Amino acid sequence: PLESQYQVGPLLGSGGFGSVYSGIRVSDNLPVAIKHVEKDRISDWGELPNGTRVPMEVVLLKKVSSGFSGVIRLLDWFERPDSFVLILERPEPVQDLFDFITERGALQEELARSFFWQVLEAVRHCHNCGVLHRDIKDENILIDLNRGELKLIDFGSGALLKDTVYTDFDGTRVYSPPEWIRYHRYHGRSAAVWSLGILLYDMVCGDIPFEHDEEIIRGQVFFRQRVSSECQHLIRWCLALRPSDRPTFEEIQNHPWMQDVLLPQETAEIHLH
Numbered sequence: 001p002l003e004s005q006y007q008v009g010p011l012l013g014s015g016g017f018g019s020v021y022s023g024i025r026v027s028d029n030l031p032v033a034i035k036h037v038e039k040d041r042i043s044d045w046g047e048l049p050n051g052t053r054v055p056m057e058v059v060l061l062k063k064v065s066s067g068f069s070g071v072i073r074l075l076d077w078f079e080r081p082d083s084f085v086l087i088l089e090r091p092e093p094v095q096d097l098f099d100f101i102t103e104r105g106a107l108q109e110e111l112a113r114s115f116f117w118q119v120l121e122a123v124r125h126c127h128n129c130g131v132l133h134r135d136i137k138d139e140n141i142l143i144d145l146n147r148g149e150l151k152l153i154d155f156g157s158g159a160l161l162k163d164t165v166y167t168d169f170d171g172t173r174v175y176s177p178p179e180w181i182r183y184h185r186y187h188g189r190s191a192a193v194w195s196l197g198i199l200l201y202d203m204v205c206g207d208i209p210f211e212h213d214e215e216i217i218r219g220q221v222f223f224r225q226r227v228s229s230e231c232q233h234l235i236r237w238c239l240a241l242r243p244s245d246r247p248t249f250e251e252i253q254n255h256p257w258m259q260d261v262l263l264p265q266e267t268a269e270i271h272l273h
């Protein structure tokens with residue numbers, strides 16, 4: 001290890017969280033992503049079975065990396081004196097959903113339906129594995145352009161899923177729910193559904209619905225693009241002010257707008273190729 005197992009390429013994205021590089025596993029050569037996180041910057045720490053002190057992100061990734069391709073999987077990890085290094089899957093070709101919507105503008109509803117459905121299945125997988133992502137948004141969704149499959153990235157803001165209130169939050173504020181803005185309290189699943197409503201609005205309108213705290217708290221949704229009544233209803237349901245008025249995942253996937261979703265490969269052939 002470890003600079004000998006992977007050839008490192010260009011930066012994909014960086015920030016106070018850390019830095020993510022394109023890479024190749026020397027022996028495959030598998031496309032990977034190499035994420036560096038400074039220990040001094042790690043806010044949330046976790047423990048491994050063998051009792052190793054490790055960024056909670058590593059704990060969460062291990063818990064979701066079973067095989068379901070809706071989450072970018074953690075292939076390996078290393079500890080350095082001042083940092084941790086994560087080796088993650090990298091689909092090629094790929095584009096994140098933020099860039100995709102930027103290039104294409106608002107998405108046709110048939111395409112938004114397929115993307116949104118796949119995000120729901122991925123988020124359901126995380127919760128089934130005991131993991132709350134806490135930063136669901138277009139930037140953190142990768143599109144495998146050949147297969148039409150979407151994949152969740154960046155669990156650096158995530159937490160173990162629990163049924164009691166969260167009093168901390170470090171995801172994206174314009175995706176955070178009104179109960180966080182107002183009371184610095186939220187429950188995991190209803191906060192996730194709120195962020196999913198923001199995500200869906202962004203897909204079909206090409207921009208997010210709320211920019212300021214007061215707009216989040218008012219909860220009035222104005223549509224700047226033509227959107228079907230069924231889609232508008234689903235979005236407004238996900239963005240209910242009262243958390244307990246929001247739909248469950250089952251209720252979202254049973255919604256009239258969500259019926260007859262395209263398969264991922266269909267999605268790619270029609271909309272991506």
Ligand SMILES: Cn1ncc(NC(=O)c2nc(-c3c(F)cccc3F)sc2N)c1N1CC[C@@H](N)[C@H](F)CC1
Pocket residue numbers: 012013014017020032033035072088089090091094095096139140142153154155156
């Ligand atoms: C903060 N954080 N932590 C892990 C990750 N990204 C990955 O893990 C990841 N990204 C991949 C990628 C991509 F995202 C875009 C184009 C091509 C790619 F191959 S492939 C892979 N495994 C991130 N990014 C979050 C925001 C993201 N939009 C930034 F572009 C990169 C930072």
